[PDB]
Amino acid sequence: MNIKELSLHELCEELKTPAWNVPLTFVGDVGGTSARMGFVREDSVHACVTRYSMKRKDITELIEFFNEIIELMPASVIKRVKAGVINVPGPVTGGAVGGPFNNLKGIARLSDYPKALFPPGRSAILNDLEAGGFGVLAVSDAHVFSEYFGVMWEGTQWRTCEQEPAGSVIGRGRCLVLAPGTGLGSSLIYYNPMNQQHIVVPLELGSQTIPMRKDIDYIQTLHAELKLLPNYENMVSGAGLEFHYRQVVRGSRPPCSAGEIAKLASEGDANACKAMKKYHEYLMRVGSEASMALLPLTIVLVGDNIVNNAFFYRNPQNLKEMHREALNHEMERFGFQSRVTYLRQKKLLNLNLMGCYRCGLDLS
Amino acid sequence: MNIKELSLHELCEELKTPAWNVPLTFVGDVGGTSARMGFVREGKNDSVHACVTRYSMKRKDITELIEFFNEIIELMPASVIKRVKAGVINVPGPVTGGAVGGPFNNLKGIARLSDYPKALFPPGRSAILNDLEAGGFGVLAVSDAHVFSEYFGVMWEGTQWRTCEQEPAGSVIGRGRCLVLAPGTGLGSSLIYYNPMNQQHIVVPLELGSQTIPMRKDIDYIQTLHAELKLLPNYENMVSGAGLEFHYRQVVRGSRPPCSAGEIAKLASEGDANACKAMKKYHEYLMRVGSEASMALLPLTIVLVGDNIVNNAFFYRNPQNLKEMHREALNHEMERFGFQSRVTYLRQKKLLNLNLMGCYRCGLDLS
Ligand SMILES: O=C(N[C@@H]1[C@@H](O)[C@H](O)[C@@H](CO)O[C@H]1O)OCC1=Cc2ccccc2S1(=O)=O
Numbered sequence: 001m002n003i004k005e006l007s008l009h010e011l012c013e014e015l016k017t018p019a020w021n022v023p024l025t026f027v028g029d030v031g032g033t034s035a036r037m038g039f040v041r042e043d044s045v046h047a048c049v050t051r052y053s054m055k056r057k058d059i060t061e062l063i064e065f066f067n068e069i070i071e072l073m074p075a076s077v078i079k080r081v082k083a084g085v086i087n088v089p090g091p092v093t094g095g096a097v098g099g100p101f102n103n104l105k106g107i108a109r110l111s112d113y114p115k116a117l118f119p120p121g122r123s124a125i126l127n128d129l130e131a132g133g134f135g136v137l138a139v140s141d142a143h144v145f146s147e148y149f150g151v152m153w154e155g156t157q158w159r160t161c162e163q164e165p166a167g168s169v170i171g172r173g174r175c176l177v178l179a180p181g182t183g184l185g186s187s188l189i190y191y192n193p194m195n196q197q198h199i200v201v202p203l204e205l206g207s208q209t210i211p212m213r214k215d216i217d218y219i220q221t222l223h224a225e226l227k228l229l230p231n232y233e234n235m236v237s238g239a240g241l242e243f244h245y246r247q248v249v250r251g252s253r254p255p256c257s258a259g260e261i262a263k264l265a266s267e268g269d270a271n272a273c274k275a276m277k278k279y280h281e282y283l284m285r286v287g288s289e290a291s292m293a294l295l296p297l298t299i300v301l302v303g304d305n306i307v308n309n310a311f312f313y314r315n316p317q318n319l320k321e322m323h324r325e326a327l328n329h330e331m332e333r334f335g336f337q338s339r340v341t342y343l344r345q346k347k348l349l350n351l352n353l354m355g356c357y358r359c360g361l362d363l364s
Numbered sequence: 365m366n367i368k369e370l371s372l373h374e375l376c377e378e379l380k381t382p383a384w385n386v387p388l389t390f391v392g393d394v395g396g397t398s399a400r401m402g403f404v405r406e407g408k409n410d411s412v413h414a415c416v417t418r419y420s421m422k423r424k425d426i427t428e429l430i431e432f433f434n435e436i437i438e439l440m441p442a443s444v445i446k447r448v449k450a451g452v453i454n455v456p457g458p459v460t461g462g463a464v465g466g467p468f469n470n471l472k473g474i475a476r477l478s479d480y481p482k483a484l485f486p487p488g489r490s491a492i493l494n495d496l497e498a499g500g501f502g503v504l505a506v507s508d509a510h511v512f513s514e515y516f517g518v519m520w521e522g523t524q525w526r527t528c529e530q531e532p533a534g535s536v537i538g539r540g541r542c543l544v545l546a547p548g549t550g551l552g553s554s555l556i557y558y559n560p561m562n563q564q565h566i567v568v569p570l571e572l573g574s575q576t577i578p579m580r581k582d583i584d585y586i587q588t589l590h591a592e593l594k595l596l597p598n599y600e601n602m603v604s605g606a607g608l609e610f611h612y613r614q615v616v617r618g619s620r621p622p623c624s625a626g627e628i629a630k631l632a633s634e635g636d637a638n639a640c641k642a643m644k645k646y647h648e649y650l651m652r653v654g655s656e657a658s659m660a661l662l663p664l665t666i667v668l669v670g671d672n673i674v675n676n677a678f679f680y681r682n683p684q685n686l687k688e689m690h691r692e693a694l695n696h697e698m699e700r701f702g703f704q705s706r707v708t709y710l711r712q713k714k715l716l717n718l719n720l721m722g723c724y725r726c727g728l729d730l731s
């Protein structure tokens with residue numbers, strides 16, 4: 001369960017090790033700023049990758065990186081590749097065509113990828129949160145769930161469906177993965193009770209139109225500013241957090257960035273704290289509506305910033321407020337939102353790289 | 365693809381015939397008012413043959429099914445019961461673990477697989493399905509029998525279809541996710557997810573009807589219903605029998621007393637302007653389920669199913685209605701990127717109990 005980020009040439013030497021004369025899975029975690037790519041081996045799951053800059057901000061650059069890797073590597077090494085899986089930050093169809101993306105131009109095309117790294121019949125392109133969901137499965141299968149995930153609150157259904165303590169395994173029930181970061185990501189780890197298998201269903205929840213509660217004025221305010229009917233991502237993003245802060249201060253303080261707002265909030269600033277609560281009020285609305293639509297056993301909040309903002313979740317007041325909002329739905333009169341166990345990532349981990357590898361296992 | 369509805373003693377008789385001397389699947393399609401239950405076999409070549417008896421849910425209680433199962437085990441040869449390889453039923457509410465169903469909004473009690481006789485529900489080969497989960501398996505059953513174009517018609521073809529397929533739209537389910545919607549008494553939904561890595565379709569039950577409706581330019585109309593219900597409206601409140609009745613009341617404005625959803629559809633078929641407008645309003649909200657789900661679930665196809673959909677073909681047959689629905693399906697901020705236009709919409713155009721076919725089709729994966 002461990003990953004070292006190495007130089008390209010260090011990597012080449014690492015794979016020359018006897019401990020890497022085994023079948024290999026090629027993996028790639030592609031962001032809009034940079035991309036980490038490398039290999040994973042076998043009861044240990046070990047990965048070493050190297051990083052590239054998405055300098056041109058064009059998804060087709062990946063091809064050059066692939067080619068370079070094949071060049072700066074011995075055929076003994078390459079010939080061991082049994083699977084190749086990458087993830088990209090946009091919708092993907094057929095597991096083979098990714099994009100368009102709003103951070104990058106171009107289209108990820110598996111058919112254009114080198115087959116030394118992407119063996120035919122053993123390769124895939126994933127959506128980033130698709131990979132992330134596979135990552136969650138990987139953590140659960142490594143028996144290390146409680147090390148990376150903390151229970152925010154246990155739902156009504158957990159103890160009936162599961163014998164293990166909440167937070168100690170993923171559970172034999174649907175898990176909705178949400179990643180409120182740059183973009184708002186979402187995937188459903190569906191559980192098939194007939195074959196007892198989990199499958200990862202990519203979703204675009206963030207782009208749904210926000211349904212109201214008692215906030216028509218606040219939504220119209222954003223609508224007027226965006227010139228678009230607000231979707232969840234508009235409220236639950238960096239840009240969303242900046243919006244919430246400006247609406248709190250009313251011009252009494254200068255406008256700050258998301259990172260800065262979050263930093264201030266950690267320092268204890270009331271304006272920034274109010275901003276974070278507003279943001280999470282809308283994140284919980286994604287949860288309450290999806291709790292009904294998708295009937296999950298668990299909802300898991302993932303991503304670096306979820307870990308780096310642990311301070312917000314540890315605060316029992318905030319937690320209580322988020323819980324109240326998670327149950328703010330008409331169907332809670334029947335207990336639907338109460339059914340669901342909410343968890344948060346509490347320790348850093350690249351779920352996406354682990355997910356690429358695990359997806360590879362279902363292929364090979 | 366065929367189902368015959370018989371009497372209990374009648375049913376009991378035909379199962380003693382040589383055609384039925386084959387492994388059987390016990391199935392049951394359970395509704396608020398009635399339940400159809402019986403046996404299904406594979407036929408030549410890819411065909412499916414069901415023999416069922418009607419049961420009225422007179423006690424409005426889901427646990428009465430238990431009595432029915434008993435009545436079938438006692439009153440039927442043990443030689444027939446021995447042929448039972450799987451047992452699958454569907455119920456009109458959410459199901460957890462394929463074993464615990466309910467609660468239901470039109471029936472009392474909880475459907476419990478553990479409380480069912482093992483004779484009709486063999487251990488390891490049995491399940492309780494949500495009705496639209498069974499419906500989704502039924503859509504697969506039609507696809508598997510090469511008869512998709514007999515039961516489903518294209519309303520409009522989406523951008524993505526030809527990108528993924530050479531055959532014409534409506535001729536196959538297609539190698540992509542299929543969202544099944546059933547606007548009937550309640551609004552049903554399931555996603556036939558498509559896993560492109562193993563080319564497998566898998567049915568994922570949903571409760572899209574109970575989501576709060578997001579707005580377009582209709583805040584006053586949503587608020588009008590809010591004031592009647594004392595609840596923020598969900599899609600089912602606008603798309604259901606009660607929803608159609610509300611739309612009719614809003615169209616007429618007291619000027620005519622209220623009539624039933626069924627009465628309203630009949631009037632619409634006879635060209636009554638007010639009922640037609642009510643039906644248009646109903647479909648405006650159904651298309652909003654569609655547009656939002658088109659984004660959230662990224663489906664290749666959306667299929668409207670149910671006796672309702674079939675019997676009200678007069679509505680979909682009309683080009684003006686279809687054009688107004690199409691427009692509403694595209695009414696979403698994300699259509700500026702073409703997401704809603706990607707999707708092909710289809711409708712059931714021939715009566716078939718998808719649920720019974722689905723219970724059978726699900727039973728195949730268990731046996
Ligand atoms: O990219 C998206 N959705 C993405 C998801 O796939 C991804 O899992 C998460 C997290 O990385 O971020 C979302 O934003 O949808 C397509 C587009 C949304 C959007 C928003 C504003 C402008 C353009 C576009 S788009 O590229 O059509």
Ligand SMILES: O=C(N[C@@H]1[C@@H](O)[C@H](O)[C@@H](CO)O[C@H]1O)OCC1=Cc2ccccc2S1(=O)=O
Binds near residue numbers: 458467468546553571
């Ligand atoms: O029953 C449900 N949902 C059902 C679905 O499972 C089903 O597929 C469709 C189609 O038949 O009907 C929906 O209504 O959700 C739970 C309930 C909703 C509801 C609405 C009003 C009163 C009570 C209740 S409930 O039984 O909690």
